[PDB]
Write a protein that binds this ligand. Structure first.
Ligand code: PLM
Length: 264
């Protein structure tokens, strides 16, 4: 039954996420090729084509860094929606109390976002805007503080994560495992969540044994990556709070304020 479960999870991931690692790699290899954003000129050209409304305000347009952060947030909002539908495929998740489902998604979504973001990153940049842009790592590093500090730690995570050479069948189960954590704050039915976690981690362990016979440590490596992601998210939330206190024009999306509320 466990092999079928792993396949169910994988198929739900292919159905629910607009981006997957095969799709990303086709684009990254070289109709509607990605526009390269490597400097301010190319950022502004890409915006006029791909997010026209955001730059249709004349002198009232926000600063480039703020527009970029707004696009970051919109991407995360969309991935939250995808993750919420994906979670229905996880055995036991839809049987939990609605409040526990909310709590698991609240604490898990950014860990999952940063894990999956690795699939659209290479050492030089990342896919954005539904695969229609490629923004360079160096351009993001060139932004004014604090905005240049957003992406670089995610690239650092992603380069090591990508060196594990996971595929979509592994990543789908890793994301399911992130969502099923019994130690999130405020859970009502910890015991049932712990059982759900044990089941999905068992599926993950057996799948990695079968799909990666060459890497006998891969399961504990991925357990460590989950802990690393929790630290990456805590640090990300600290930076977002700096932006919220010091950058008045950088409006925080109403759906993401709730995810951050009483996190770190
Ligand atoms: C014209 C397109 C500009 C694109 C600007 C960069 C888009 C990055 C998308 C990935 C965001 C990852 C970080 C999310 C941060 C957050 O939600 O707090």
């Amino acid at each position: 039954d466990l092999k079928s479960l792993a396949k169910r999870i994988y198929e739900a991931y292919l159905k629910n996420f607009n981006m997957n690692k095969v799709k990303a790699r086709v684009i990254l290899s070289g109709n509607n090729p990605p526009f390269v954003i490597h400097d301010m000129e190319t950022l502004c050209m890409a915006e006029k084509t791909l997010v026209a409304k955001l730059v249709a305000n004349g002198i009232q347009n926000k600063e480039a860094e703020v527009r970029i952060f707004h696009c970051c947030q919109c991407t995360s909002v969309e991935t939250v929606t995808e993750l919420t539908e994906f979670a229905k495929a996880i055995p036991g998740f839809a049987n939990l109390d609605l409040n526990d489902q909310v709590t698991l998604l609240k604490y898990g979504v950014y860990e999952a976002i940063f894990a999956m973001l690795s699939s659209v990153m290479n050492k030089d940049g990342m896919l954005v805007a539904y695969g229609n842009g490629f923004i360079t790592r160096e351009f993001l590093k060139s932004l004014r503080k604090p905005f240049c500090d957003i992406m670089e730690p995610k690239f650092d995570f992603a380069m090591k994560f990508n060196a594990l050479e996971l595929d979509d069948s592994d990543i789908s189960l890793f994301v399911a495992a992130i969502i099923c954590c019994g130690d999130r704050p405020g859970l009502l039915n910890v015991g049932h969540i712990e059982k759900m976690q044990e089941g999905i981690v068992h599926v993950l362990r057996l799948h990695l044994q079968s799909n990666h016979p060459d890497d006998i440590f891969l399961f504990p490596k991925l357990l460590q990556k989950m802990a690393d992601l929790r630290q990456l998210v805590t640090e990300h939330a600290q930076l977002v709070q700096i932006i919220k206190k010091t950058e008045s024009d950088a409006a925080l999306h109403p759906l993401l304020q709730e995810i951050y509320r009483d996190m770190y």
